[PDB]
Write a structure and sequence with these properties.
Two copies of one chain form a homodimer. The first copy, chain A, is of the alpha/beta class and 502 residues long. The first copy, chain A, has two domains: 283 residues, 3-Layer(aba) Sandwich (Aldehyde Dehydrogenase, Chain A, domain 1), CATH 3.40.605; 189 residues, 3-Layer(aba) Sandwich (Aldehyde Dehydrogenase, Chain A, domain 2), CATH 3.40.309. Chain A has a seven-stranded mixed beta sheet, with helices on both faces. The two termini of chain A are 36 Å apart. At the A-B interface, helix 9, helix 10, helix 14, strand 21 and strand 22 of A face helix 9, helix 10, strand 21 and strand 22 of B. Strand 22 of chain A pairs parallel with strand 21 of chain B, so a sheet runs across the interface. Chain B: It catalyses: L-glutamate 5-semialdehyde + NAD(+) + H2O = L-glutamate + NADH + 2 H(+). Chain B: Belongs to the aldehyde dehydrogenase family.
């Protein structure tokens, strides 16, 4: 006849200022000192048991690679298998738990992050991942808190004669969540979202984000997350993927990272398709970005937007570099402003100097990669380094912000590189096509133009060149439920025959 | 600032009565006679070009397998590849077309089907697929019409400092739609839904549903669907799958059919993963049903529900036979009522006799399968045929509705695919019903539907928890019988100029 309901109003988390004299600035400073010198030991967590293995690993500070910030271990097949079994034992009760109940866990956690644990979380992202205040704040705080509150909201709204009804069921089995280095929030969401939906998760956090990943983990457990819903199981990547794609109980993989790696996981699952009790759901986020500038663009905006986009977090928010496309008529003006501003950019230790724009790159393997695209860069006939190009790793993995002009339109870094292509003004329409036919798995893109019709046009053309598309600014859960309709009849059935048959 | 959301209000299509004297009954009768004797030639359609190939095929009437209802051909790789390239050429314009525009096409089509073309469509499903009036009507009409209207509705209701906005883009490439035999509507939706979302489709319709599949196709084209948005390309299954999983331009497969076949398509795509410009989206619907009866159940309801569910469309709405679970205390009463009612069931030609409950099974390969299964069943020590078991294919692929009791909860044949009018019964001790519920849950691999019959409200709540993963559709005291096609682009446009690279804190 009539039902009660409850839904959920939520607001975006505020990005704090952190200005001199601010409560948040002092909180963070105290947070950072409480981390200086110290190093945390982080076990694998299966259920409520903290587990250590022979295979020990260290997370070091990127801008001070002599500082080991975390000691942790990799889980072995034995331990991963134990974690899987433990999770499955917990799954049916978890799934049956009303979503409001499960949402409340993620809401408490969001609130913990929002205030009391914000400094610790920001501090652990700065120190362990080399992020500046503003970068840690928009990721580990803002984004992550918002994921938690908004996911909770979508999940609760979802569950909001002859009587029909829908039931949103977790997937039957376990979800493997596999986090990337460059975001704290993404890791939290990779494990958090499937869990919210009544799933149990094996979470393999990124080795270069262990300290903060584990902070997020503990916060969720302190917020009420039962044991065995999310297993915290750092591990070797190949070992982990091999193990979980081999389990008959795999029902999903929630992945962020490279296209090759994903393809590989996909092929693994396909190879073992006959062993799974259910078809596994594979979610993978995998790339590129460009700034396309039209002759009408506002140069000041273009320059700051392009610098922020190219170099923030040392260009590690995107796999490749930022490709800049500048019309010839504006190039002289922009090249000057870029070079001027570039030399004003301060790269250093983000904990000590808040004036640091960006710090060191994430690790040694990463530093190596960047150096090779700097040696064998300063060679290529089509490339002239206009700025930067240096990099020293005696104290930390420090790379100078580098700017490069190319004369060749079609020439995976993860470093602070800005590539520039100067195009003739008359050939801008053909250059837009070049951007579209140049991007394989495009992440973001921006168009800069004061002409409204150039924008409308660029948007049509670049429709498949970026999943996030910005106009005059810098370019920077249903999968986990399975619906069951339940229809119910209240009157009896009558004859099996139909009228018309008589 | 203003916001303007457009909303589409739509109602469920009415299932017509078809009673003596009704306008719809006469319309259908005239429709059927206009089909008697005739046989339609159905080419492949790429763009607006009707194409024939050497490889010619015939669709026959199941209840009169001497009557060829349709002549059609299979597309070759050369034709499939031509269709693919043609579709891609049309895709960007189609995707850019406002969804309201694209929705209107599917709404006109729904309306065409709803009235003026309803009889033709019902008639071609009856005659080509062996469905009775009521079966054709709930499928080829009601459900297909509703897909069209409701999808249109959801698509339109989707597209409803700085300024944010979302854009729902079709997938970049072509979608392969692969239809099953047992539904006209499902075929329509497999091709129709991706299309609505700005996609171009290669549609491989089921060979045993060609006549009606093509009717639906032609209706859509008459409703305004541009050329090369959906290519009508009947083909050999292996050939088609091989060809489309080999295309760098594959962006999706929309499949309904068996788990093996799907797994196979999936493995094919995985194998060619490095060649695709985009990760293809694979949608597959793949199984089992059961009727679980509790001691409190209303026997009359159980009996008519179970008959309808077991035998309508000759059990072809479901790969596996219906498995009735009956408590010992009620079995005597239910066995009797089932046997009584069973013998009253008329199996025949659905076009001449509207008193036919169900007609012949879909085809010869299908008939064969059922003849073997029944033979495997019979012999077997744990199976007693209580009724039916006969089947004659001299005039059509006719199988008698068969009822079987098993003494083994885990009877193997019962796991094998039948697709025929078989009702398997398992009598369980009343005291052991909780354990029997567990048996149903631990017996279903890929469950399609399931029903619980019980007048006890707490047994129902309980059965619902336990059988939570045993059925995607679950019925209480009745018989147990698009987002994927869009990738969202977010578009932030900032109106104030930007400022310096530095930050406040810095």
């Amino acid at each position: 006849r009539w039902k009660h309901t409850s839904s959920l109003k939520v607001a975006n988390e505020p990005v704090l200022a952190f200005t001199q004299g601010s409560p948040e600035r002092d909180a963070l400073q105290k947070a950072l000192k409480d981390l200086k010198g110290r190093m945390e030991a982080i076990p694998c967590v299966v259920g409520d048991e903290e587990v250590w293995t022979s295979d020990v690993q260290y997370q070091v500070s990127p801008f001070n690679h002599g500082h080991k910030v975390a000691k942790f271990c990799y889980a072995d097949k034995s331990l991963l298998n134990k974690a899987i079994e433990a999770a499955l034992a917990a799954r049916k009760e978890w799934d049956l738990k009303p979503i409001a109940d499960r949402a409340q866990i993620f809401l408490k956690a969001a609130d913990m992050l929002s205030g009391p644990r914000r400094a610790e979380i920001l501090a652990k992202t700065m120190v362990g991942q080399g992020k500046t205040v503003i970068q840690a704040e928009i990721d580990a705080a803002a984004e992550l808190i918002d994921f938690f509150r908004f996911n909770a909201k979508y999940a609760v709204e979802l569950e909001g004669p002859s009587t029909n009804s829908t039931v949103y069921r977790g997937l039957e089995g376990f979800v493997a969540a596999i986090s990337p280095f460059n975001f704290t929030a993404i890791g939290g969401n990779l494990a958090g979202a499937p869990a919210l939906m009544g799933n149990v998760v094996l979470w393999k956090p990124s080795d270069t984000a262990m300290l903060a990943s584990y902070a997020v983990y503990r916060i969720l457990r302190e917020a009420g997350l039962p044991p065995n819903i999310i297993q915290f199981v750092p591990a070797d990547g190949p070992l982990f993927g091999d193990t979980v794609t081999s389990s008959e109980h795999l029902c999903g993989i929630n992945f962020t990272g490279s296209v090759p790696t994903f393809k590989h996981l996909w092929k693994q699952v396909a190879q073992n398709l006959d062993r799974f009790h259910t078809f596994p759901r594979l979610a993978g986020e995998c790339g590129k970005n460009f700034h396309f500038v039209h002759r009408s663009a506002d140069v000041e905006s273009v320059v700051s937007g392009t610098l922020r986009s190219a170099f923030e977090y040392g260009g590690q928010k995107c796999s490749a570099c930022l490709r800049l496309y500048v019309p010839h008529s504006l190039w002289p003006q922009i090249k000057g402003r870029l070079l001027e501003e570039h030399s004003r950019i301060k790269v250093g230790d983000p904990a000590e100097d808040f004036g640091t724009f960006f710090s060191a790159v994430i690790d040694a393997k990463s530093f190596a990669r960047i150096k090779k695209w700097l040696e064998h860069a300063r060679s290529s006939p089509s490339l002239t380094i206009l700025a930067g190009g240096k990099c020293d790793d005696s104290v930390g993995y420090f790379v100078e912000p580098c700017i490069v002009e190319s004369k060749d339109p079609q020439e995976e870094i993860f470093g602070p590189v800005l590539s520039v292509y100067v195009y003739p003004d008359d050939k801008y329409k053909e250059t837009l096509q070049l951007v579209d036919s140049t991007t394989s798995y495009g992440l973001t893109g921006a168009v800069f133009s004061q002409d409204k019709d150039v924008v409308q046009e660029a948007t049509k053309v670049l429709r498949n060149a970026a999943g996030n598309f910005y106009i005059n600014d810098k370019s920077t859960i249903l999968r986990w439920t399975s619906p069951q309709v339940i229809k119910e009849t209240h009157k009896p059935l009558g004859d099996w025959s139909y009228a018309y048959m008589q």
